[PDB]
C-alpha cells in the first residue's frame, strides 16, 4: 500500500492533494466496495468499505480525505505460561495457580460422504488472551507439562474502531480529524495520512492501538525461548506470563489498558508532503525524519528501506523538483493521477545498466558447465524503458531475473541512514556468476511461458472480462514498482493473469483535492464493484483501469443526478 | 488402472487378447516412457518403463503380453515399540533392551537469500524398519517417554523386482511367465494379468511380496493404539514390537522371510476372461469368484465393488454375450480397441432415469427456500447418451451432480455378493430433496464456469498442445467411467483441463494379440513421449489419442525400418 | 420502517441517501449484497464458524483474506472461540446508539436482497440457490466487524489458536 498527503506548498493551491492507494485483495470479503453515504444532517461520506462493513474506512467528505497503509508496528505479543505441575490447564502467576477458562465447542462438519457429523474440542483462555499452539513456530515450543503459550492482541479489547471511522466520516476539518484520532487511539493495524480543506499541512500518523512495553521491561521479561525466537518475531514482546511486572504498561495519556499513550505515538505535519509505502514511521517525510518512538513501531533508520519505499519517496521529491518529466513542479490532482500509474521500476532504473555492463560482455556464457546465449536477453534489457507500461518490452524478463538475484553480498554500498533513498547500491562484481545464473533461469522461464523476451507487458499482465484480456501495467514491490499489479500466477502458467487471487495490488485508488467549488475525487476500483460475472459491474471499472481512465466520482447531489448513467430506486421495510 | 486378459474361447482365434490400461501420472518421474529393447539373441521386448527404469514393466514380446493394476493387498505394517525408561532410543524385545540404529544426516539447504546452509538431524532404524512420526495420524500417537512407532515395508528387503521384469521381458511362453512370477514372488504392489501365444487361458494373479500375518496374530498382537486407529488403516497389521511371536511369519514356500508363501496368494486361469479395475482379487472372473486367501489381500465378497469395477466387468460380459452394440460376441483386437474407449458412464446408465423420474416432475423447484429452474438441466440429462464421448452433450453436468450426491442410504437394494455387478441399486425416493440440492449446485457450478449445460464434453475436457485444445473423452472413476480421463482442475477454473497434473488417467494403453504372422500391439501414450514443449514428440501422440487413433507400434525389424517416420542413428563411447 | 434511496452512477457506484443511520445501514447492506452476494454469504459462514457444516471440514477457505486460507474446521474453531457471544456482547455494549442502529439496518438490508435472490433473477447464479445463502443477524455483522480488527494478531495465528491443546 502507498499513500501521499501533499500540502499547499506542494500543490500551489488553497488545499492539498490526498493520494490513497491500498494494495489489497482482489477477491473475498476483505475486498473493497465503493459507495457514498448521505445521511440527513449527519454525514456525507464517500470512499470504500470491506464487504460486510457499514462505514467508510478510506475516503473523503466535504472537508477531509484520508487513507491507510499497513503499519510496521506490532499489534500483539506472546506470554509464556509456567504450568502448575499435575495440572496442564492451569498456570502459575506470582506464585498462585490460576485456571485457564475452558470452552467446549462443537462444530458440525460435512463428511466427504455427504452426511453431517459433529467435531468437538475444548479450547482455553488465559487472562492475556487465547492459548496458542506454537509447535509450528518451533517444535520445542509445544504445550508441554511444564509450559504453555498464549497470544495477546491489543485489538481483542479495542471496541472503538467503528466509531472512529464513523466520526471521521462526519469530520468537518483536518484539525477535527486529528483530534478524533488522538481521542480514540483506536486505529488497529494501519498508518493514516490525511489532507483537509483550507489546511496547509498534510497529516501522517501511526496513532492507534499499540502494545505498551518498556525497554527495561523487555530486558527483564523476555524468556529464554523469547530470546531464541526473537529474530523470527522482530519487536514482538515475548514475555514472562508468570510475573505481573511484565504485564503491558499503561501511560498517563493511554486510552486503553496495556496500550501506548497518545503523545508517545509518531505523527507528523508537513506543508510539502508526507507518505508511506509500508515501511516504518521513520521516513514520513524524507527531509524531516521521525525518531524517538517505542521500538515496537518498527526500525527508525536502522534498516534499509524497501525498493518500493525508495521509489515512492523518489517520486515525491522529483515531482517537487520538477525533474520527473511531468509539467511544472507541483503535486496537482491532475499530475498526481498520471504520476502514480507511471509504473517506474526502481531496481531497473538504479541497477539494470550496472548488471548489464557486468555480465553482458561477452553475452555468450558458461553457466553451470553449460553454453548459454544471452545476447538477445542483453539487447532486449538494454533497449527496455525500465517501466512496466502496457507497451513496455522485456519488463517481464526483468521480473523473472530480479526476483531470482541472490541478495547476500549483492550491494557493495551498504545502507546509510544519511542517504536512505540511494543506499544500499553498487552491484557487486563478485556477484557476476550468480547474476548470470539468475538471468539464465529468467530466460528459460520466459521461454516456457511462450512469451517472447521483448513482448509488450500488456500481453503478459492482464485481467480477463467478457472473454477479453484487458492489458494491465505495473508490477510487484519486490522489483521496486510503486504501481502495483502483482500476480500470484507463475509466468509459465499463462502469464501474469490477475484473474485468480493476486497478491496485494492496486484496488481502491483515489486522488482527492479541494478546489473552491468543493471536493473533487478521481477513483478506481480495479477489480470492479461486483463479483458476479453476469453483472454489468463485473468488468466496467476494470476496463477503465486498463485504459488509465480515472473515474471522476460524483459527490454533490447535482453531480449525482446529472451523471450520464444515473439510476435511482427506493427500498423500504419493517 | 484397468486390465483384461481374454482367452481363446473369448477371442475365437488361436491366441488371446491382452488389454493394458494403467491409470497413472501424466507428469513427473513416475510417468511412463514407451520403448522397444532388442538385445542380440537375448531379448526383444516392447512397452513402457517409468522414467529412470531400464527394463520394461508393462509390455509384450513375441510370446507374452502383460499389464498391472495397483492391488488392494497391503504391503506394510506398523510396530509399536515399548521404550526403555530413561532411554527413548531403546526398545524391549521379550524383556531385553535393544538399541535403535542411529544415523546422523546433514542436508545442505538453499536459504531464501541465495546462500546454502547445513541442516542436520539424527534419525533411527529399528529391526523392523525406520522409525515413523505418527502424531499427524493422531496427536496421541507421538513418540513419548514409553512409546515409539516403526514402519515395516516388505519391499524394503525385496531386491528381486527388477530381475523379475527382466526375466519377463525375455520369457518365451505364458507357462514360463507364470513360473517366473512364482519363483520370484517379487511383484511389489500390483496385480498382474498376462496372455501367452498358443495358450488357451488368460492369467490373473496377485502373486508378489506381501506381509505374512496369521488370524491368531492379528487378534493377539494388535495393540490398544492399533485397535484405536485400525479403522484408518484397514487390514494394516499394527502389532506389538515387544513380542517376537508378533514378528511376520514365514511359510515353507515363502520366497522371502516375513512374506506370504506362494500357494496362499490369489491366482486364476480362465479361457474366457480375467480382469481387474483396482478391487481385490475376488472377482478376477465374475463367474468364478476367488475366496479363502489371507485377509491382508482385501475383502472377498463382503464389500461392494467400485462403480468402475462394475463397469469393467459389465463391459466384459456384455461383449461375450453380444449385447454391447458391437459386432459379434468375440473379444477380438479391433473390437477391444473400440470398447475400451467407449466412455460409458455406469452411474448414469444405472441411476439417471431413476433420478430424473424422481425429481424432474415438475422441473421448476424450490431448493433451500429458493426458486430453481431445472427444465434445461432435466431435458439435457434426459437426452444425454450416458457416455463421455467428445460430442456427448451434458456429461459434465452429470459429473458435477453425481459427485455431489450424499450416499448415506441412497440405495434401497444393498450390496449382494451373488449380484456384485448390479448391487447396490435402486434410488431411494426419500433422497429426493438431497438430489435436487445436488442438482441445484451442479447447475450453479457449470453456470459460473462459462460452459453451457449441454456443451459437448470435448470442449470441457481437453489437452492443449501447440496452443490448440485437443478434445478428449472419458472421465473419473467416481462416476463409474472405465475410460479414465480425470482432471484435477475444478470446472470453474477453465473446465476439465489435462494440462496440469491430473489424477490417475489413461497413460500407456496397449491392446496386444498374437496372430500367426507375429505379435500385434496397438498403443497410446496419452500425454506423448517428451516433457519438452519444443519437442516434436510433446503433442503428437496426444493428438492421436484425441482422435482415438490407436498406434500400430512397429515390432519386427521390417516393421521398424518400413515405418513412414523411420530414423536411425547409432551412439557409442568407451 | 427503514427507507433508503439508492442512486447508481457510472461503474455502478451506489450513493445511499437516508434520513437516519439505521436506514443508511439498510441501503448500504442492500447494495453490497446486491453486488457481492456469493462472496458475502460465504464470508458469514466464516465469521460464525459454520463453514464446515456446509462446505466440509477439510476444505480450505474459498477466498484469501486477512485470515489466510486455513482448513474450514480450524477456521470454524478459531472464530467460535475468539469471536464468542461474550466478545460480541462486549463489542456491542461499547457502541454508540446510531451505530447499533446502522448495523441493524445493514443486516436487514442484506436479508432483503437474500429474499430477492431466493425469489428469482439471473444475478448470483453461482450461489443463489445454496443453503448458505440465508439471512443473518445484527450480531453476525458485529462478528464481521470484530474480525477485521484482529488482522494484526489473532488472525495470523488462527490454525494455531484452534489447535492449542494440553498434553
Amino acid at each position: 500500500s502507498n499513500m501521499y498527503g501533499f500540502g499547499t506548498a506542494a500543490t500551489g493551491e488553497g488545499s492539498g492533494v490526498l493520494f490513497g492507494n491500498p494494495h489489497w485483495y482482489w477477491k473475498g470479503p476483505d475486498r473493497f466496495y465503493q459507495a457514498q453515504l448521505t445521511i440527513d444532517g449527519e454525514a456525507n461520506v464517500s470512499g470504500v468499505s470491506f464487504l460486510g462493513l457499514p462505514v467508510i474506512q478510506i475516503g473523503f467528505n466535504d472537508s477531509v480525505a484520508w487513507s491507510h497503509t499497513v503499519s510496521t508496528a506490532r499489534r500483539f505479543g506472546f506470554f509464556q505460561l509456567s504450568l502448575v505441575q499435575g495440572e496442564p490447564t492451569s498456570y502459575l502467576r506470582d506464585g498462585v495457580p490460576v485456571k485457564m477458562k475452558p470452552a467446549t465447542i462443537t462444530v458440525p462438519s460435512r463428511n466427504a460422504d455427504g452426511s453431517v457429523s459433529d467435531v468437538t474440542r475444548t479450547l482455553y483462555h488465559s487472562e492475556f488472551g487465547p492459548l496458542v499452539n506454537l509447535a509450528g513456530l518451533n517444535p520445542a515450543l509445544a504445550w508441554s507439562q511444564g509450559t504453555a503459550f498464549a497470544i495477546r492482541d491489543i485489538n481483542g479489547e479495542n471496541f472503538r474502531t467503528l466509531r472512529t471511522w464513523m466520526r471521521w466520516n462526519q469530520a468537518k476539518s483536518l484539525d477535527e480529524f486529528i483530534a478524533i484520532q488522538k481521542e480514540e487511539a483506536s486505529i488497529p493495524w494501519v498508518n493514516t495520512v490525511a489532507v483537509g480543506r483550507g489546511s496547509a499541512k498534510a497529516w501522517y500518523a501511526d496513532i492507534g492501538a499499540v502494545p505498551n512495553v518498556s525497554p527495561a521491561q523487555t530486558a527483564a521479561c523476555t524468556t529464554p525461548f523469547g530470546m531464541a525466537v526473537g529474530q523470527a518475531l522482530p519487536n514482538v514482546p515475548f514475555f514472562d506470563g508468570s510475573r505481573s511486572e511484565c504485564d503491558w504498561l499503561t501511560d498517563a495519556d493511554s486510552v486503553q489498558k496495556g496500550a501506548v499513550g497518545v503523545s508517545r505515538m509518531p505523527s507528523l505535519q508537513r506543508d510539502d508532503y508526507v507518505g508511506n509505502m509500508n515501511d516504518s514511521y521513520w521516513l514520513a517525510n524524507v527531509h524531516a525524519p521521525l525518531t524517538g518512538y517505542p521500538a515496537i513501531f518498527g526500525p527508525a533508520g536502522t534498516s534499509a528501506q524497501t525498493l518500493r519505499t525508495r521509489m515512492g519517496h523518489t517520486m515525491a521529491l522529483e515531482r517537487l523538483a520538477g525533474t520527473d518529466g511531468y509539467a511544472g513542479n507541483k503535486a496537482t490532482s491532475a499530475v498526481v493521477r498520471e504520476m502514480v500509474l507511471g509504473s517506474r521500476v526502481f531496481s531497473a532504473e538504479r541497477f539494470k545498466d550496472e548488471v548489464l555492463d557486468l555480465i553482458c560482455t561477452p553475452a555468450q556464457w558458461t553457466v553451470n558447465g553449460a553454453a548459454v546465449d544471452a545476447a538477445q536477453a542483453c539487447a532486449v534489457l538494454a533497449a527496455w524503458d525500465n517501466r512496466g507500461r502496457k507497451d513496455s518490452r522485456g519488463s517481464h524478463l526483468w521480473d523473472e531475473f530480479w526476483s531470482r538475484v541472490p541478495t547476500a553480498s549483492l550491494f557493495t554500498v551498504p545502507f546509510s541512514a544519511a542517504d536512505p533513498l540511494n543506499t544500499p547500491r553498487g552491484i557487486n562484481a563478485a556477484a557476476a556468476d550468480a547474476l548470470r545464473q539468475a538471468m539464465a533461469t529468467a530466460i528459460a522461464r520466459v521461454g516456457q511461458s511462450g512469451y517472447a523476451l521483448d513482448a509488450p507487458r500488456g500481453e503478459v499482465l492482464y485481467a480477463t472480462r467478457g472473454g477479453t484480456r484487458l492489458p494491465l501495467y505495473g508490477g510487484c514491490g519486490a522489483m521496486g514498482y510503486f504501481t502495483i499489479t502483482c500476480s500470484e500466477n507463475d509466468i509459465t502458467q499463462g502469464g501474469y493473469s490477475m484473474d485468480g487471487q493476486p497478491n496485494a495490488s492496486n484496488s481502491y485508488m483515489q486522488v482527492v483535492s479541494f478546489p473552491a467549488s468543493g471536493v473533487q475525487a478521481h477513483t478506481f476500483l480495479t477489480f470492479s464493484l461486483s463479483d458476479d460475472p453476469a453483472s454489468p459491474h463485473h468488468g466496467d471499472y476494470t476496463k477503465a483501469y486498463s485504459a488509465g481512465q480515472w473515474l471522476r466520482v460524483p459527490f454533490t447531489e447535482a453531480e449525482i443526478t446529472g451523471n450520464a448513467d444515473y439510476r435511482t430506486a427506493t427500498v423500504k421495510e419493517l | 488402472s484397468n486390465m483384461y486378459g481374454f482367452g481363446t474361447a473369448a477371442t475365437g482365434e488361436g491366441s488371446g487378447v491382452l488389454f493394458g490400461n494403467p491409470h497413472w501420472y501424466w507428469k513427473g518421474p513416475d510417468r511412463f516412457y514407451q520403448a522397444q529393447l532388442t538385445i542380440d539373441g537375448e531379448a526383444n521386448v516392447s512397452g513402457v518403463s517409468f522414467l529412470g527404469l531400464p527394463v520394461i514393466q508393462i509390455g509384450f514380446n513375441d510370446s507374452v503380453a502383460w499389464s498391472h493394476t495397483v492391488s488392494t493387498a497391503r504391503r506394510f505394517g506398523f510396530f509399536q515399540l515399548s521404550l526403555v525408561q530413561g532411554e527413548p532410543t531403546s526398545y524391549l524385545r521379550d524383556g531385553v533392551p535393544v538399541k535403535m540404529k542411529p544415523a546422523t544426516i546433514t542436508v545442505p539447504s538453499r536459504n531464501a537469500d541465495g546462500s546454502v546452509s547445513d541442516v542436520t538431524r539424527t534419525l533411527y532404524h529399528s529391526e523392523f524398519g525406520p522409525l515413523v512420526n505418527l502424531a499427524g495420524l493422531n496427536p496421541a500417537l507421538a513418540w513419548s517417554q514409553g512409546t515409539a512407532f516403526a514402519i515395516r515395508d516388505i519391499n524394503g528387503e525385496n531386491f528381486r523386482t527388477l530381475r523379475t521384469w527382466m526375466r519377463w521381458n525375455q520369457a518365451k511362453s505364458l507357462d514360463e511367465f507364470i513360473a517366473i512370477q512364482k519363483e520370484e514372488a517379487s511383484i511389489p504392489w500390483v496385480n498382474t494379468v498376462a496372455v501367452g501365444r498358443g495358450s488357451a487361458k488368460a492369467w490373473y494373479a496377485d502373486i508378489g511380496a506381501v506381509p505374512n500375518v496369521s488370524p491368531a496374530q492379528t487378534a493377539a498382537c494388535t495393540t490398544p493404539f492399533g485397535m484405536a486407529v485400525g479403522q484408518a488403516l484397514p487390514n494394516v497389521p499394527f502389532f506389538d514390537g515387544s513380542r517376537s511371536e508378533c514378528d511376520w511369519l514365514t511359510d515353507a514356500d515363502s520366497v522371502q522371510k516375513g512374506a506370504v508363501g506362494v500357494s496362499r496368494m490369489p491366482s486364476l486361469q480362465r479361457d474366457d476372461y480375467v480382469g481387474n479395475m483396482n478391487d481385490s482379487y475376488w472377482l478376477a472372473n465374475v463367474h468364478a469368484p476367488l475366496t479363502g486367501y489371507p485377509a491382508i489381500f482385501g475383502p472377498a465378497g463382503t464389500s461392494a465393488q467400485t462403480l468402475r469395477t462394475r463397469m469393467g466387468h459389465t463391459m466384459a460380459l456384455e461383449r461375450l454375450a453380444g449385447t454391447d452394440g458391437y459386432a459379434g460376441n468375440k473379444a477380438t483386437s479391433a473390437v477391444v480397441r473400440e470398447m475400451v474407449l467407449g466412455s460409458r458412464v455406469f452411474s448414469a446408465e444405472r441411476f439417471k432415469d431413476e433420478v430424473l423420474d424422481l425429481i424432474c416432475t415438475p422441473a421448476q423447484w424450490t431448493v433451500n427456500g429458493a426458486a430453481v429452474d431445472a427444465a434445461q438441466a432435466c431435458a439435457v440429462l434426459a437426452a444425454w447418451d450416458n457416455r463421455g464421448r467428445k460430442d456427448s452433450r451434458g456429461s459434465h453436468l452429470w459429473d458435477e451432480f453425481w459427485s455431489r450426491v450424499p450416499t448415506a442410504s441412497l440405495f434401497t437394494v444393498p450390496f449382494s455378493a451373488a449380484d456384485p455387478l448390479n448391487t447396490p441399486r435402486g434410488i431411494n425416493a426419500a433422497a429426493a430433496d438431497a438430489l435436487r440440492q445436488a442438482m441445484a449446485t451442479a447447475i450453479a457450478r457449470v453456470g459460473q464456469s462459462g460452459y453451457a449445460l449441454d456443451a459437448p464434453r470435448g470442449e470441457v475436457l481437453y489437452a492443449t498442445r501447440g496452443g490448440t485444445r485437443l478434445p478428449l473423452y472419458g472421465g473419473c472413476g467416481a462416476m463409474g467411467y472405465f475410460t479414465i480421463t480425470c482432471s484435477e482442475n475444478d470446472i470453474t477454473q477453465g473446465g476439465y483441463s489435462m494440462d496440469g497434473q491430473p489424477n490417475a488417467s489413461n497413460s500407456y494403453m496397449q491392446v496386444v494379440s498374437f496372430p500367426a504372422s507375429g505379435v500385434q500391439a496397438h498403443t497410446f501414450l496419452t500425454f506423448s513421449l517428451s516433457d519438452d514443449p519444443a519437442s516434436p514428440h510433446h503433442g503428437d501422440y496426444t493428438k492421436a489419442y484425441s482422435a482415438g487413433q490407436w498406434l500400430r507400434v512397429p515390432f519386427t525389424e521390417a516393421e521398424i525400418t518400413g515405418n513412414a517416420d523411420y530414423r536411425t542413428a547409432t551412439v557409442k563411447e568407451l | 420502517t427503514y427507507s433508503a434511496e439508492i442512486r447508481r452512477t457510472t461503474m455502478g457506484v451506489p450513493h445511499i441517501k437516508a434520513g437516519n443511520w439505521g436506514s443508511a445501514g439498510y441501503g448500504f447492506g442492500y447494495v453490497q449484497a446486491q453486488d457481492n452476494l456469493c462472496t458475502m454469504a460465504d464470508s458469514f459462514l466464516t465469521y460464525r464458524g459454520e463453514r464446515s457444516r456446509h462446505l466440509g471440514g477439510s476444505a480450505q477457505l474459498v477466498y484469501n483474506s486477512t485470515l489466510g486460507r486455513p482448513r474450514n474446521i480450524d477456521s470454524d474453531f478459531f472464530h467460535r472461540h475468539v469471536i464468542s457471544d461474550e466478545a460480541v456482547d462486549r463489542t456491542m455494549a461499547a457502541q454508540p446508539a446510531k451505530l447499533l442502529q446502522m448495523v441493524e439496518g445493514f443486516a436487514a438490508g442484506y436479508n432483503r436482497y437474500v429474499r430477492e435472490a431466493k425469489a428469482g433473477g439471473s444475478a448470483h447464479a453461482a450461489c443463489r440457490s445454496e443453503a448458505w445463502v440465508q439471512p443473518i443477524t445484527a450480531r453476525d455483522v458485529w462478528r464481521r466487524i470484530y474480525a477485521a480488527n484482529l488482522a494484526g494478531g489473532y488472525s495470523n495465528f488462527a490454525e494455531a489458536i484452534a489447535n492449542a491443546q494440553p498434553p
Binding site: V70, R74, N138, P224, A228 | - | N156
Partner: peptide, 16 residues
C-alpha cells in the same frame, strides 16, 4: 532449543 527448526511466520497483514 534448535534455531534451525524455527519457522518464521509471515506477520505482514495483507502480504504473502
Amino acid at each position: 532449543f534448535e534455531p534451525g527448526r524455527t519457522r518464521a511466520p509471515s506477520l505482514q497483514v495483507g502480504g504473502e
